[PDB]
Design a protein around this ligand. Structure first.
Ligand code: 5RP
Ligand code: 5RP
Ligand code: MN
Ligand code: MN
Ligand code: MN
Ligand code: MN
Lengths: 216, 216
């Protein structure tokens, strides 16, 4: 069972602490949501240490649809409305209109261009016009309350950054197997081993926030 | 120079004929746009023969942001408005709001789910509600006139399908190098060799349409 499979990463508190420490060191982590939800593992990286090589890894190993998780304040600062008014997607994933950096990029898709666009959007001094729309980076609005309000990877990502003392912005992308099927827990653990990436779950995060009166 | 590099695929007419023949056989092709434009090569597949293995190849070898090129009529039939009203992206790429199949899929990202969503959207009997919005497939509206009106991969894709006698819908995604840089003409030719994919250019297509009074 999943809990058993993740015992080798530690108990849930340790799984969380190790994930926060990796983010502080500028490395990436792997977050699983609930098995009854998507049952998917996302590579997560902090924006402030994001490199081209980290972006290249997400693109060649994940779905390629790399999302920027932002606070509501930061999405508002950028004037990013939701992509659609009545979002009838399954999880109601909070996609804004997509974005490209307006300067410093060419077609927008190269790993470097995506990082340039991500760092431009996430800049606390960003202004709306720094971003052309549409583009090849996909922002997601994290709910206030984080994973204590919505058990999504979006909220997990921004919560991880805050809990780690980092700028509240991170990127994510779903781990995909070579044959196009989505990575399940055994493949996610194995990929974390290869790439020295801690593995944790939203459930670990909820327990942790609800054991250390953590309001972010 | 590029023209020289592509002489080994034939003269421009032959490059086009070989691309149309591969599509009819259900294989994929590689389309380059103008060197002064994006200078990028897209893997293109026809929707009607699209398989999970073909979708898995685009995801692990390309940007992962897989687009469905549709006619204006078909995008209208699906009630797909442009993602943004004032599109200030560089090429004014005609992104609609993104889509997922409403039935037959789980999270939407697996290669199989994307094909399910693509085949649902492209179905000539499709209705708007067959697609949830937003999602993980990105439709693009091809301009009337095709590449004789707009020299984009979008129009190249739908034009290729029509010229080949196929249903006017195809998918595309930009060929990406392992390190995240975008594939340039030498890498595109080499990738076409490996995967037995013809290579052609929008310029080949414009010449061809303007040498065989081809109005589609
Ligand atoms: O759809 C996705 C991004 O395109 C992934 O499923 C991402 O994890 C969605 O976020 P969430 O888990 O918060 O709904
Ligand atoms: O942006 C893209 C898809 O996301 C690619 O550049 C695609 O080729 C864009 O289409 P076009 O060449 O017609 O502008
Ligand atoms: Mn910020
Ligand atoms: Mn998710
Ligand atoms: Mn059609
Ligand atoms: Mn293009």
């Amino acid at each position: 069972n999943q809990s058993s499979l993740l015992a080798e990463f530690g108990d849930p508190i340790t799984r969380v602490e190790n994930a926060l420490q990796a983010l502080r060191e500028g490395r990436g982590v792997l977050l699983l949501d609930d098995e009854d939800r998507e049952n998917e593992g996302d590579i997560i990286y902090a924006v402030e240490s994001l490199t081209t090589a980290q972006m290249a890894l997400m693109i060649r190993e994940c779905s390629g649809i790399v999302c920027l998780c932002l606070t509501e304040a930061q999405a508002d600062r950028l004037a990013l409305p939701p992509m659609v008014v009545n979002n009838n997607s399954a999880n109601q994933t909070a996609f804004t209109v997509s974005i490209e950096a307006k300067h410093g990029v060419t077609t927008g898709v190269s790993a470097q261009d995506r990082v340039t666009t991500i760092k431009t959007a996430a800049n606390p001094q960003a202004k709306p016009e720094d971003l052309a729309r549409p583009g090849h980076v996909f922002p997601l609005r994290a709910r206030a309350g984080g994973v204590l309000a919505r058990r999504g990877h979006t909220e997990g990502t921004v919560d991880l950054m805050q809990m780690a003392g980092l700028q509240p912005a991170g990127v994510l992308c779903e781990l995909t197997n070579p044959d196009g099927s989505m990575a399940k827990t055994p493949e996610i653990i194995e990929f974390g081993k290869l790439h020295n990436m801690p593995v944790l779950t939203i459930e670990d995060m909820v327990q942790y926030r609800i054991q250390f009166d953590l309001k972010l």
